[PDB]
Design a protein around this ligand. Sequence first.
Ligand SMILES: CCc1c[nH]c2ncnc(NCC(C)(C)CC(F)(F)F)c12
Ligand SMILES: [Cl-]
Length: 167
Amino acid sequence: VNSFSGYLKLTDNVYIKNADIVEEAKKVKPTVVVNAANVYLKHGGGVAGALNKATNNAMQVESDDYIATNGPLKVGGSCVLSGHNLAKHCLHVVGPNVNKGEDIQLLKSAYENFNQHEVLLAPLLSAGIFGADPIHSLRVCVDTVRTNVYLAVFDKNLYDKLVSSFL
Ligand SMILES: CCc1c[nH]c2ncnc(NCC(C)(C)CC(F)(F)F)c12
Ligand SMILES: [Cl-]
């Protein structure tokens, strides 16, 4: 039993809700919140900009030190950093950004990072400003993630379409 509330169950392990991931993280304080990161951990907009803003830019400060030490992530890769005031940990995961021309096949690799964590609060990878089809991203999530994932979909219209079109 966990503290996530109001989710619709899609499969044995995948759950979904119309929610602002920022507000959801603040309420649940999950062990892991997933960020829709880029390789430079520059948290400018989309989910990343919103999460960082909620940390009062502490996520960005920590991220800049991470990059200065380690260099950029790989597309499809991830790193674990602090969750600040939102969660114990933040798993920064880089899905491909279609608006940069990146290979959509890397979306599966991106979701594989979730399997290293038993329970996660997450957005749909590569959706929103990353330019992928959110319906496809959900299909890849369900077919790749085996651990327990609670998906937050900000857009109510999109949430309804995701549920109504789910196979
Ligand atoms: C600023 C963005 C954002 C803040 N809080 C969030 N929580 C969840 N998902 C988010 N964005 C991903 C979507 C849901 C695919 C974006 C889209 F497609 F609907 F426009 C956000
Ligand atoms: Cl977005």
